[PDB]
């Protein structure tokens, strides 16, 4: 009769189960890692390194818009009804070259370009023309890009998500990189084109093995914004079982700022003056004492949250990373090995 | 001057308060005392759908009431058979993070969306015997929170970029854009006639829209936190909402003001999903505390609980027939209630 319909509807259900089990042996054998953090944290450079060892193209698109924004400003200076007055008595071909890039068939983008505007950026007339060039349909991201010109000038510059927000080259809401360490398989998800309000889409990553929190130590108030974000992540009811691998990234810059000059962390963090380098501190060879104190004071600011709130369900793995570090993959691999073992030992009630 | 513009704004908004307060003469709970309560409403788990690896985020019932699609964060769309529990379709997605799914009223396509900012439409019945991706609607600069089908070529989506959108599936372009929400749009419910539809966002407000013109006809307030779910009353003249303030409210499009509040002091968790009975007499809501309450929509009393889930109840819904109630949860399991 129509019991034949069951034969296909049982055979079809079956020819799905044998692949759903094949999909289970691959899903459970791969660790999922969320790569959170602010844009200038170096998270993007860490990702580039991870892919190369084991989104970047947007740099050219940042460069072209910056060139258009700067050249636009030089033409604007003239367009002003009182054509603005330039503080530099002579352009020296700086402004002239900028003009010479007009409707370039495509811009090679050699360094002289930047050097030319790097100096013209603070020009009294240039700033005044840009302020007027507001009326001359001034670009929204021009001021921001003009401020970052030194950061962009570096050949090894790789744009932050704050930079890719200012430009419009982000279309894909999430970026993936699958890497394998010691034959183990890891899936890292760099959240792309999403708004700054995370209280809804952060609940999707409640089952990842670890959230990688990349932080900029040299930015000490960005650093306080990274501490309130960590605190809300650590205290969320849905992320209460998710471990957090903490990456205090910009170690080289933290060291220069602290050793070279006095930007007092004491200004923006008062209790640093009453802080002593810990006894379990392991300063590396040649590591100056204050920086070896600056590293652990910023590290203990996050550990204060994870201890005051952590009830024994989620753990925190701080690392004094640097974005170029080749060991970052291994650091993540060893922390995921520790997370899985602590989960098994809690099932047996051995911990 | 922003100050003058934001001052005429209170001059304009305060008058709406008195227009609704003047219309208030007798509470709905005050006019329903000549009728009897419905008593305790017990329901049982008839089926239990298994096969999803990760948590279940969304489920849309079929008008046929024979199939239903489920979206799970492990990158899988699964269409079930609520009578035989057999897996009809298994769709391997190219982006595991999905947050919604829809049952097209024609059964030829299914919808889904999530963190990839791309609404994917899959052709269930192509004339060679393989499901594959029919169309990818690109736009919306944010997560897709809810998508509902209009026909085989029109679909309304809601996103985390605080907007809604109408699409064209053949070309790929976006037809309409609904702007006005200041927070992430969470849920949407099409009206019976599909002339209107309501949307609840993270701004603690419900907005009544017009798919035809594109302007916000009405804006409903009274909730205290993000509205996570919204559904139309069957007669089309009302709608209920579920917020993070542990409260459900029954508004009314005609009177433009709230009519009933469904809350309990023992209830302190946010509502994740809402649905009405086929007669609209029972308001069913999914909660964060793993339970599902059965409210008397006419007397604001409680009349039953659907307590069979181990993790957070993410989705809810009644069949077009009006008997089965499906519940998804973060425990990877679906349940049919009756």
């Amino acid at each position: 009769d129509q019991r034949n319909e069951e034969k296909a509807q049982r055979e079809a259900n079956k020819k799905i189960e044998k692949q759903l089990q094949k999909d289970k042996q691959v899903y459970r054998a791969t660790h999922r890692l969320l790569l959170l953090g602010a844009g200038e944290s170096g998270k993007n450079t860490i990702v580039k390194q991870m892919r190369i060892l084991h989104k970047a193209t947007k740099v050219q698109d940042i460069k072209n818009n910056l060139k258009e924004a700067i050249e636009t400003i030089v033409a604007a200076m003239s367009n002003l009804v009182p054509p603005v007055e330039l503080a530099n008595p002579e352009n020296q071909f700086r402004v002239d070259y900028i003009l010479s890039v007009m409707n370039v068939p495509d811009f090679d983008f050699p360094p002289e370009f930047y050097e030319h505007a790097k100096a013209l950026w603070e020009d009294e007339g240039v700033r005044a023309c840009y302020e007027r060039s507001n009326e001359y349909q001034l670009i929204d991201c021009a001021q921001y890009f003009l401020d970052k010109i030194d950061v962009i000038k570096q050949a090894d510059y790789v744009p932050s998500d704050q930079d890719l927000l200012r430009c419009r080259v982000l279309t894909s809401g999430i970026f993936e990189t699958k890497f394998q360490v010691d034959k183990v398989n890891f899936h890292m998800f760099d959240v792309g084109a999403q708004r700054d309000e995370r209280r809804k889409w952060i609940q999707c990553f409640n089952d990842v093995t670890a959230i990688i929190f990349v932080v900029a130590s040299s930015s000490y108030n960005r650093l306080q914004a990274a501490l309130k974000l960590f605190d809300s992540i650590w205290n969320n009811k849905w992320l209460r079982d998710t471990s957090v691998i903490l990456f205090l990234n910009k170690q080289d810059l933290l060291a220069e700022k602290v050793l070279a000059g006095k930007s007092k962390i004491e200004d923006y963090f008062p209790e640093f003056a009453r802080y002593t380098t810990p006894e379990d501190a392991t300063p590396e060879p040649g590591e100056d004492p204050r920086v070896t104190r600056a590293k652990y004071f910023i590290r203990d600011e996050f550990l204060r949250i994870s201890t005051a709130s952590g009830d024994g369900r989620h753990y925190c793995y701080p690392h004094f990373t640097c974005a170029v570090d080749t060991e970052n993959i291994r650091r993540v691999f060893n922390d995921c090995r520790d997370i899985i073992q602590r989960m098994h030992l809690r099932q047996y009630e051995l911990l | 001057e922003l100050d003058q513009l934001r001052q005429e704004a209170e001059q304009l908004k305060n008058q709406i308060r008195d227009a609704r307060k003047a219309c208030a003469d007798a509470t709905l709970s005050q006019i329903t005392n000549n009728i009897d309560p419905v008593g305790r409403i017990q329901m049982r788990t008839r089926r239990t759908l298994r096969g999803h690896l990760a948590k279940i985020y969304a489920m849309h019932w079929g008008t046929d009431s024979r199939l239903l699609v489920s979206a799970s964060q492990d990158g899988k769309l699964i269409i079930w058979d609520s009578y035989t529990t057999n897996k009809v379709h298994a769709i391997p997605l190219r982006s595991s993070w999905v947050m919604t799914c829809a049952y097209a009223p024609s059964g030829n396509y299914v919808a889904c969306g999530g963190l990839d900012n791309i609404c994917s439409i899959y052709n269930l019945k192509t004339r060679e015997g393989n499901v594959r991706v029919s169309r990818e609607l690109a736009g919306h600069t944010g997560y897709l929170s809810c998508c509902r089908f209009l026909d085989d070529n029109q679909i309304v989506t809601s996103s985390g970029d605080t907007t809604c959108a109408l699409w064209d599936i053949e070309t790929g372009q976006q037809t309409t854009t609904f702007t006005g929400h200041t927070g992430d749009v969470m849920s949407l419910s099409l009206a019976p006639d599909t002339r209107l539809f309501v949307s609840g966002a993270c701004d603690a407000s419900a907005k009544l829209w017009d798919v035809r013109e594109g302007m916000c006809r009405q804006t409903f307030t009274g909730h205290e936190s993000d509205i996570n779910a919204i559904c139309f009353f069957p007669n089309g003249n009302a709608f209920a909402t579920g917020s993070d303030d542990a409260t459900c409210r029954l508004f009314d499009l005609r009177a433009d003001q709230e009519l009933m509040t469904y809350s309990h002091d023992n209830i302190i968790c946010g509502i994740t999903s809402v649905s009405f009975s086929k007669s609209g007499r029972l308001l069913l809501a999914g909660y964060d505390d793993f339970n599902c309450n059965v409210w008397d929509a006419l007397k604001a009393d409680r009349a039953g609980v659907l307590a069979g889930h181990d993790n957070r109840v993410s989705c809810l819904g009644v069949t077009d027939d009006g008997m089965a109630v499906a519940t998804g949860s973060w425990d990877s399991f679906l349940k049919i209630w009756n």
Epitope: - | T221, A246, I268
Partner: nanobody
Framework: QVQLQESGGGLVQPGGSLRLSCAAS????????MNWVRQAPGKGLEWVSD????????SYTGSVKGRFTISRDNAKNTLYLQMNSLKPEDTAVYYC?????????????????????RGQGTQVTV
Amino acid sequence: QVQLQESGGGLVQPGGSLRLSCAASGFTFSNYKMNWVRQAPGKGLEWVSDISQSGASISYTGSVKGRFTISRDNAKNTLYLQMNSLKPEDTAVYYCARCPAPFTRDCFDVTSTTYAYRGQGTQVTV
């Protein structure tokens, strides 16, 4: 509906004091955590302080401790920010922000560019 109205502020001399008030309506004040946020001219939003539902837990940023003090009267739905020893660096629009969900331990997006449960603010110039 959820409405937060901030009062007080204006131009003041350095080393002075200021009393900022935030009148709430449209929600149960005793169920939510409160915050104070500011936006310096030419800079993003920065979290200033926060107080719990009852007040038994208070926090401040690393540049206002000892000077600012935040209090709330749950019986009258009011949030205060008593400011003292003001510097020309604390000049900004000060917003009264509410935590998204009630009975919650975290507040995720109180300093985002677009956040609903936040007043129009009051300008404080030093």
